[model samples]
Target chain A: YFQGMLKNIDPALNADVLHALRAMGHGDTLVISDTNFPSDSVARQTTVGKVLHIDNVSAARAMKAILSVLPLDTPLQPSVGRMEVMGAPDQLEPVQVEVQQEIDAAEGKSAPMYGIERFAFYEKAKQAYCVITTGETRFYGCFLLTKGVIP
Target chain B: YFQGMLKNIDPALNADVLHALRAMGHGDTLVISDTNFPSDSVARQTTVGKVLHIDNVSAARAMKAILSVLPLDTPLQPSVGRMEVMGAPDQLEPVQVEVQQEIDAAEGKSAPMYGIERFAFYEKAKQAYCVITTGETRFYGCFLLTKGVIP
Candidate 1:
């Protein structure tokens, strides 16, 4: 089942994506690809240490795959409705909606999205257990996923 | 003596800067200033932070202040040098020379500078211990300072 679901991924970057998957642990994060990423060299150089990538896939598909397998640990309940606007404008509406929907559907409760400014995001990403770069084209569809325990 | 320096800073921003300073452990990084930083707001938010208004100061002078007070723990050697074709028309001719001179005079050692693409610089700036936004108008005068122990 898992193998079939991942078929939509681009071949050039899929190996890198798998590499990112293997690297993630609890409270870890993976980056979906954006249009700006230089897949080949970045993938090779940042394999394990700093950045990880999932190439040539939409954020939704990438999120689905990860969400399906990984369990959500913290149930974030924010008092505000607006996603906190971090530093600059991040065109990540589609990715954000999908993430919340997936969480809501799975947990049968509303999920909250917290907005982090640009610098703050970078700071958090660096401190993450790991960073995964995906093939996501949507701006800032890349996410920092906190790990949860197995039930 | 420190009071004279304090007179030049924005008192409101000092708090925020101090907080950032505290959060910065030995060998952790701290940025002095950036061109676009909302200095007053950031200062208000920080605690025990010191904001020296080197708005019109040279990079050398700025380095002098930091080096004089903060003992150098790890000297980050420069590995990359820019070439004319790499968007920096002059390459490492002028500024690189200045950097070498500064290091020799102030820190007593010369670190080599590495050559990287412009976009690559952005990626690296994000990885800095903390980015200090200076009022520097020169294109690429920013230097990365590795922290040292306070012994």
Candidate 2:
């Protein structure tokens, strides 16, 4: 069973992962990026819990690791920018396809993806719980995951 | 004379400005912009009163128009970002000098340009009475104006 509480994630897994998760509260979010993502001034300015150096990690692996302990509440309707709408939607572009595969492996059901304007996505990401920069290289691999209660 | 309040100067100011001024009651601000400034986002979001479009007008000219009616509150400090530590810093970028000149012309006093970290500036801007986005190509050509009673 997945732990519903965000704080329950084991800190021993990875220092950066632990820090990133902690900084991003239960309702808060952290954006994960690969090495190629653009410079995020917001990340530098805001004080986040931890910076995890997950460079070059596959999005699937990263999601798996995060989901191993983190619980997803039922009825996940996470939103993201569409490939055609975002300036560099390619980064998260592939990740969008893989999200369901990862979700199916962990939670037994696929979640829905909502599309928003490019600038709107950036603005929303800026306000997320805490963004995690990952090492995935697939275009538009960035995503906003909402923490949900585990059934 | 600048008979109306800051809200009267530009209808395209930030929403926070109207909310802040309304809370303060008597304090007013000014909104000066060049011909090329993008007022859509600002105007669509704010509830300011006047909408002055000083197209091709010099910053000084814009200030003169403002001063004709509104009186600058004495013993007031004009807030400005430092020349060196402005805009996505780590690049030694300077904000527009013309904006500084306009503030001086309107107040008849040199306001101290306060140096703040980039993120801190963003934080303060979010709370400013009125944030003017200039059409000038000069980087960081923006200022947050506060109103005071003319002495």
* TM, every model: 0.36, 0.39
Query: Given candidate 1, what's the lDDT at residue A116?
Result: 64
Q: Write the per-residue lDDT of candidate 2 for residues A39-135, one digit (tens) a residue.
A: 2654653345334454456766666666654545436445222333345433345566785566567666655455655566566666765556666
Alpha-carbon runs more than 4 Å astray in model 2 = A1-13, A22-24, A45-50, A73-92, B1-151
Give the chain A TM-score for each candidate.
Answer: 0.62, 0.68
Interface DockQ of each model: 0.01, 0.01
Task: Compare the candidates by lDDT and give the number of the best one.
Answer: 2
- The worst-scoring run of ten residues by lDDT in candidate 2 chain B lies at B1-10
Q: Measured with DockQ on alpha carbons, how good is candidate 2?
A: 0.01
* Candidate 2: tens digits of C-alpha lDDT, residues B30-148: 34444333444444434342333434445444444444333444465544344234444443333345555655676577864445564554444444444443344544444444455
Candidate 1 CAPRI grade: incorrect
